[PDB]
Each structure stands twice: as C-alpha cells, then as structure tokens.
Amino acid sequence: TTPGPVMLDVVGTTLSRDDARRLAHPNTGGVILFARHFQNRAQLTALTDSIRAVREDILIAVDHEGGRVQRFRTDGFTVLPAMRRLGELWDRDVLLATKVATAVGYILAAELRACGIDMSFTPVLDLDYGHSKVIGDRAFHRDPRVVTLLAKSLNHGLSLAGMANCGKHFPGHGFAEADSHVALPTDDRTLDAILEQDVAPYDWLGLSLAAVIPAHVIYTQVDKRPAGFSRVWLQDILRGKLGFTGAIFSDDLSMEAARTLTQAADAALAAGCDMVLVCNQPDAAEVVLNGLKARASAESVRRIKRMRARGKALKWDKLIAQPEYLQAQALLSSALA
Amino acid sequence: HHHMKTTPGPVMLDVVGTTLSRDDARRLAHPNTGGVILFARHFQNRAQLTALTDSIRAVREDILIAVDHEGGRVQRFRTDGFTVLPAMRRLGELWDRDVLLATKVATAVGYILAAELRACGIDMSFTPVLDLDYGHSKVIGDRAFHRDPRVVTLLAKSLNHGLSLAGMANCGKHFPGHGFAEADSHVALPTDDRTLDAILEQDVAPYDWLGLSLAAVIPAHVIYTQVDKRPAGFSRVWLQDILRGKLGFTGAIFSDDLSMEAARETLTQAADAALAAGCDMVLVCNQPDAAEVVLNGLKARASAESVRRIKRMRARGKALKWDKLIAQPEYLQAQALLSSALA
Ligand SMILES: CC(=O)N[C@@H]1[C@@H](O)[C@H](O)[C@@H](CO)O[C@H]1O
Ligand SMILES: CC(=O)N[C@@H]1[C@@H](O)[C@H](O)[C@@H](CO)O[C@H]1O
Ligand SMILES: [Cl-]
Ligand SMILES: [Cl-]
Numbered sequence: 041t042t043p044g045p046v047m048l049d050v051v052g053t054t055l056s057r058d059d060a061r062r063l064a065h066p067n068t069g070g071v072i073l074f075a076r077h078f079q080n081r082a083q084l085t086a087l088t089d090s091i092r093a094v095r096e097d098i099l100i101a102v103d104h105e106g107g108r109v110q111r112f113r114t115d116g117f118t119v120l121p122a123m124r125r126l127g128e129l130w131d132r133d134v135l136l137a138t139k140v141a142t143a144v145g146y147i148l149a150a151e152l153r154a155c156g157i158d159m160s161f162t163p164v165l166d167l168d169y170g171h172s173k174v175i176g177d178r179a180f181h182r183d184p185r186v187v188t189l190l191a192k193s194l195n196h197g198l199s200l201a202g203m204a205n206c207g208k209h210f211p212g213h214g215f216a217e218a219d220s221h222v223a224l225p226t227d228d229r230t231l232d233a234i235l236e237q238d239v240a241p242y243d244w245l246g247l248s249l250a251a252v253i254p255a256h257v258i259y260t261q262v263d264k265r266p267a268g269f270s271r272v273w274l275q276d277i278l279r280g281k282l283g284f285t286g287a288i289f290s291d292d293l294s295m296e297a298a299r300t301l302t303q304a305a306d307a308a309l310a311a312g313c314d315m316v317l318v319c320n321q322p323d324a325a326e327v328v329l330n331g332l333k334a335r336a337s338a339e340s341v342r343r344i345k346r347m348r349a350r351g352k353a354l355k356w357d358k359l360i361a362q363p364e365y366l367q368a369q370a371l372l373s374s375a376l377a
Numbered sequence: 378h379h380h381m382k383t384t385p386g387p388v389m390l391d392v393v394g395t396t397l398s399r400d401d402a403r404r405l406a407h408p409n410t411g412g413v414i415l416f417a418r419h420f421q422n423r424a425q426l427t428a429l430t431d432s433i434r435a436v437r438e439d440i441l442i443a444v445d446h447e448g449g450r451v452q453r454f455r456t457d458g459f460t461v462l463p464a465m466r467r468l469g470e471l472w473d474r475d476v477l478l479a480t481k482v483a484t485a486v487g488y489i490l491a492a493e494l495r496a497c498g499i500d501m502s503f504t505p506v507l508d509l510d511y512g513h514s515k516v517i518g519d520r521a522f523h524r525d526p527r528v529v530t531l532l533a534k535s536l537n538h539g540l541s542l543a544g545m546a547n548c549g550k551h552f553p554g555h556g557f558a559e560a561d562s563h564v565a566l567p568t569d570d571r572t573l574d575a576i577l578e579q580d581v582a583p584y585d586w587l588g589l590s591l592a593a594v595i596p597a598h599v600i601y602t603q604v605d606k607r608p609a610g611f612s613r614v615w616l617q618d619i620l621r622g623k624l625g626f627t628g629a630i631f632s633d634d635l636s637m638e639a640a641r642e643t644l645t646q647a648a649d650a651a652l653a654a655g656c657d658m659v660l661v662c663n664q665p666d667a668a669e670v671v672l673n674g675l676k677a678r679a680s681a682e683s684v685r686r687i688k689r690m691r692a693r694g695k696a697l698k699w700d701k702l703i704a705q706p707e708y709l710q711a712q713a714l715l716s717s718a719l720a
C-alpha cells in the first residue's frame with residue numbers, strides 16, 4: 041500500500057477498531073499525535089508500533105518545537121527551550137548558538153525516534169517581528185539570515201538522528217496580527233516585501249529544508265486565497281521561483297481560517313499540498329477520506345515517502361547511555377537558563 | 378550473512394587492486410582490521426568499484442570503507458559520472474561575496490559528494506579540512522575553506538549537513554590545526570611554536586564549535602612545541618586533555634597515515650603509540666605487507682567504546698543506486714546550484 045493524502049489523529053492512548061478502519065483507508069497517509077496520546081514512553085511506543093502494524097507505510101508526526109509547543113514533556117522527554125531563546129543566545133555568541141541549536145535538534149529527534157515517531161513539524165521560520173501572538177516566542181529571531189542559520193543548525197541535529205523537518209508557516213506568519221486558529225489573518229504587504237524577508241529562509245535553506253506547512257493567512261496584495269489554498273503561493277512561488285521539491289503539508293483544516301472540510305481538502309491539494317491535516321475530529325476526517333476528489337498523486341507520494349525517518353534508531357534503553365545524547369544534554373543545561 | 382562472530386579492529390589499511398586478492402581477504406579477516414581506505418588506483422569505473430566494495434563487505438561484515446573525497450586537489454574518483462568537486466577554498470571565496478548562498482552551496486556539495494559515494498558502496502569521506510588558511514602551508518593550500526575559524530566552522534557545518542542528508546558521517550582534520558606550520562607532514566616533521574592559548578583561540582575553535590556536527594577527527598602529525606614534544610596523534614595531552622577532555626569529544630579518532638615521514642617520530646610502535654594516546658583507528662596506507670606486520674604485532678586491545686565509535690562511522694539508511702540518484706530532483710537541484718553559484 042502507498043500513502044494517501046490525509047494526515048489525521050487517533051482517538052486515544054491505545055488503538056481502537058475505528059482508528060484501524062481509518063488507518064487502512066487508501067486516502068490515509070499520516071497520523072499526527074497530541075498531548076492526549078501520551079501517558080508515558082512505554083504506552084506511546086506501543087501505540088506507534090500498533091499504528092504501523094495496521095498501515096506499514098504511514099507517516100507519524102507531532103508538534104515538537106519546544107517552549108509553548110511540545111506535546112510530550114514528561115517521562116523522560118526533555119523540555120526544550122522556546123526557539124526565541126536560541127536567537128537570544130545568538131545575540132550573545134553566534135557560534136555557540138549554532139552548536140546549541142544542533143544539540144536541541146538531536147535531542148528532539150532522538151527522543152521522538154525512540155518512541156517510533158517519524159518527524160516533528162519544526163522549524164518555525166516565521167520572523168520575530170513582535171506582531172503575532174500565535175507565533176510569539178516560537179520564532180527564532182527577527183533577522184531572516186539568523187533564522188536561516190539557526191534553523192539550519194537545528195535541522196542538522198534532526199538529521200543526525202535520521203529525522204527530516206518542516207518549515208512553517210510559509211510564506212510567513214510573523215507579520216500578520218490575527219491567530220489563524222480562531223480568525224482569518226491578513227497581511228497587506230507587497231509580494232516583493234514578503235519575498236525579501238519572510239520567504240528568504242525557505243530559499244536559503246536549500247536541501248536543508250525537507251518540507252513546508254503554509255500559513256492560513258491571506259496576503260491581500262498577492263492572492264485572495266489563504267496560502268495553503270493558493271496556487272500562486274504553493275506553485276508559482278514555492279515550486280516555481282524557489283524550485284522547492286519537498287513535501288507540502290496543509291496547516292490544520294480544522295482551524296477557523298481554513299473555513300466543508302472535504303472541499304477545503306480538495307482545494308489544498310489542488311493548490312499544491314501533498315498532504316492535508318485534519319486534526320481533532322477523526323469522524324469528520326473519515327468523511328474527507330471517503331469524499332475526497334481523485335487526483336494525480338505519484339509525485340506527491342515520492343515526497344511523502346521521503347519524510348519517513350531514515351536508518352535505525354536507538355530505543356530508549358540504549359539512548360539513555362549514549363555519549364552523544366549525554367553531551368547534548370550537558371550542553372543544553374549549561375548554555376541555556 | 379557472516380558465519381563468523383567478529384568485531385572491528387583498529388587498523389584501516391588498503392587493498393592491492395581493483396579486485397580483491399587472496400592476500401587482501403586474509404588481511405580483511407584479521408581481528409585487528411577495522412577498515413579499508415581507497416585510493417585512485419582502486420578505481421577503474423563505477424561497476425568495478427561497486428563490486429569491489431561489495432566484495433570487501435562480504436569478507437568482513439562490519440568493515441568501514443573510506444576515501445579522501447575533499448574536492449579540488451584531493452578527490453580520488455573523478456570519472457565515469459563522478460562529479461568533480463571544487464576546492465574548499467572556492468566556498469570561502471563565495472562566502473566573501475554572499476554568506477547565505479555559500480552555506481546553501483556547501484550543503485549541495487556535501488550532498489553530491491556523499492550520495493555519489495553511497496551509490497558505490499562507500500561509507501565515508503575524510504572531509505572536512507578544518508585547517509585555517511594562513512597561506513603558510515603548501516600541503517594544505519586550497520584545501521582550507523577560509524582564514525577565519527568562524528567561517529571555516531559554518532561552511533564545514535553546512536558541508537557536513539549535506540553529507541548527513543545522504544546518511545554519511547564526516548571527519549575533521551588535521552587536529553589541532555595544520556594551517557599555521559610550514560612543513561609537509563608527508564615528507565618532514567612540521568613544528569608549530571604558538572602558545573596553547575593561541576592555538577585554542579583560532580585553530581581548535583572549529584572542533585569546539587561544531588559539536589555533534591563533527592563525527593570524527595584526524596590529528597595532525599605536527600609537533601606543537603609549547604604544548605607537547607609529541608606529534609598530536611601520539612599526544613595524550615592533545616587527544617585526552619584537550620579533545621576528549623576540554624572539548625568533550627565523543628566521536629572516532631583516526632590517526633593520520635602512519636606511512637608518512639612525520640609518523641616516524643616503526644609502524645607497529647607508531648600504531649601502538651597512536652592508539653595508546655587516544656586514536657580509535659590507525660591508518661596504514663600504501664604498504665599492505667607492512668600493514669599486515671602491524672596487524673600481527675599490535676599490542677593494543679580495543680575498548681568497547683572504540684568499537685562503538687568505529688561502528689557509528691558506517692553510513693546510515695538506504696542509498697539510491699546511481700541510475701536513480703542521477704534522476705532525483707534534489708540531486709539535480711544540487712548540481713544546478715553548483716554550476717550556477719560557482720561560475
Ligand atoms: C499557526 C499555527 O500555530 N499553526 C499550527 C501548526 O504550527 C501546527 O503544526 C498544526 C498541527 O497541529 O496546527 C496548527 O494549528
Ligand atoms: C596532512 C595531510 O594531507 N594528511 C593526509 C590526510 O588528509 C588523508 O586523509 C590521509 C589518508 O589518505 O593521508 C594523509 O597524508
Ligand atoms: Cl519505550
Ligand atoms: Cl539546493
């Protein structure tokens with residue numbers, strides 16, 4: 041079986057019959073996990089194993105950014121800094137900040153891999169303008185050159201554990217005021233202004249950027265469609281001008297800005313997303329699985345398969361004794377308050 | 378399948394030719410062998426090279442296979458589709474025009490370098506050179522990225538990221554820095570008379586700053602007269618007190634080639650001195666019979682931790698075969714960027 045375009049979630053800490061039905065659907069390609077899916081490492085590892093047992097080619101993801109966005113924060117998961125802390129470190133010592141960013145990435149990925157997770161939806165490449173509450177301390181820095189090199193160093197750490205990455209929220213959520221969870225944010229800047237600054241990290245990262253999530257933000261001088269439903273943003277700019285060949289994941293179609301779910305999914309995929317997220321309503325996601333309009337998918341499937349974690353990973357009982365992991369832990373503890 | 382229970386030994390040696398002989402097979406099965414380094418004489422074409430690396434792994438399942446693919450003046454395989462890579466100095470020149478572009482190009486170069494080697498069954502390249510470009514060292518020359526250790530660090534880091542995208546590790550060299558000394562360690566014993574603080578401030582800084590982005594190190598056969606009378610690869614002060622100790626380095630340490638004239642400061646004694654000082658593996662190049670004397674004479678017993686470090690140098694994950702690689706969009710993007718950005 042090959043991955044479908046929909047990433048959805050499961051009902052709880054153990055798989056149900058209804059989850060198994062959805063996981064077997066040809067239009068399912070992923071699972072996203074939240075805090076409610078985590079009781080402890082043993083339970084989470086059993087859950088991810090059970091998911092892969094139903095659907096061998098499934099991608100399993102989570103939001104592990106650090107700071108305010110980190111689903112698993114107990115039973116030995118390391119509580120990671122807000123990414124803003126790394127930009128503050130850079131302002132004091134550029135080179136140390138890059139070293140610490142790698143150590144954070146390695147820890148982040150290695151601990152996720154130990155529980156059988158493929159990837160985290162990180163890094164946030166949004167610029168820290170100070171304008172956006174929803175982003176806030178999730179942004180690395182104001183300066184796109186600094187965002188790029190800190191995010192690159194983080195992504196390097198992720199790669200040391202065989203993990204990919206996903207830059208977000210393209211072409212930039214940092215400037216717009218509103219929260220896309222609960223409203224429809226707008227950004228009235230010119231295309232050239234957005235390209236010069238906010239898009240620059242996506243371009244400069246090159247092969248170091250594996251995937252993107254687009255913002256549910258309307259860039260009113262560029263397209264009246266939100267970026268994840270915009271052929272202009274996803275094809276003309278990201279695939280075209282930037283030459284990007286990695287996976288594109290819609291932002292959560294359950295979010296107010298994304299406003300049927302099936303129509304929004306079809307529109308996201310037509311615009312250029314390879315996978316669509318439907319979070320926190322699995323029955324409604326099942327309606328999407330069965331209602332989605334047919335489309336060419338071979339090019340999307342190549343990209344989706346390339347988001348699976350690479351190589352072997354250490355289980356927890358080995359990771360806890362690994363010198364690299366221990367060195368990374370010591371550096372985090374000493375370099376950051 | 379390997380019928381015999383073995384663990385990798387400390388010696389990295391070479392084979393006699395383009396196909397394995399009986400005598401190579403004997404050396405590859407010796408308990409003290411842990412790796413093979415390939416040179417230009419081992420390369421006729423990709424098909425032959427891939428068969429040779431496969432044949433090496435079949436004799437010794439846990440063997441590490443390495444090559445010097447730096448780019449520029451140091452690149453063993455340059456034909457039958459291998460991409461001729463720039464001298465690392467070119468990346469530092471690009472940095473001086475456009476820092477961010479340089480970092481993007483460095484990753485592209487790393488990815489091409491590693492992916493091509495993976496397609497032919499090689500684990501790793503002995504790159505990056507972290508030596509600083511003082512303009513003093515002919516043996517280093519355009520192999521150095523840049524004068525400034527901060528620039529060397531970030532370009533090398535970006536290169537190593539590219540290597541990691543293809544599942545390949547890396548090896549920083551030649552620690553604590555070959556760029557300041559004049560002499561060529563292939564034919565002479567170079568000296569460097571700077572204070573420890575001066576050497577730590579600049580030349581060692583990339584090793585410290587790279588952190589986990591640095592997988593391994595080759596020490597220089599250079600005497601740093603203010604720090605230790607022993608060349609760095611035979612110095613417990615350099616390897617234990619500075620590298621393992623001060624810097625907390627946990628990766629593999631490979632001696633520089635013990636066949637070099639500087640290493641004469643016998644082969645077996647030199648290997649034992651290198652391993653005692655802190656090397657996990659020793660290189661013995663271009664004299665397989667002499668390497669075999671070392672195999673049978675070596676006193677060192679490898680620790681479990683050296684074995685772990687050596688095993689972690691093996692390439693990770695699945696690699697694309699050549700015909701798939703050259704049609705891959707990401708490889709094609711990397712090639713296009715090299716062609717445009719370095720013109
Ligand atoms: C602007 C924003 O925060 N969007 C988030 C995104 O970061 C996250 O990856 C996704 C999946 O949980 O959910 C969205 O709400
Ligand atoms: C100073 C110098 O160039 N040393 C080289 C080293 O870079 C190379 O990796 C090794 C194995 O071929 O041989 C040494 O001669
Ligand atoms: Cl577990
Ligand atoms: Cl690229």
Ligand SMILES: [Cl-]
Nearest residue numbers: 368371588589
């Ligand atoms: Cl570290």
Ligand SMILES: [Cl-]
Nearest residue numbers: 342346705706
């Ligand atoms: Cl591919």
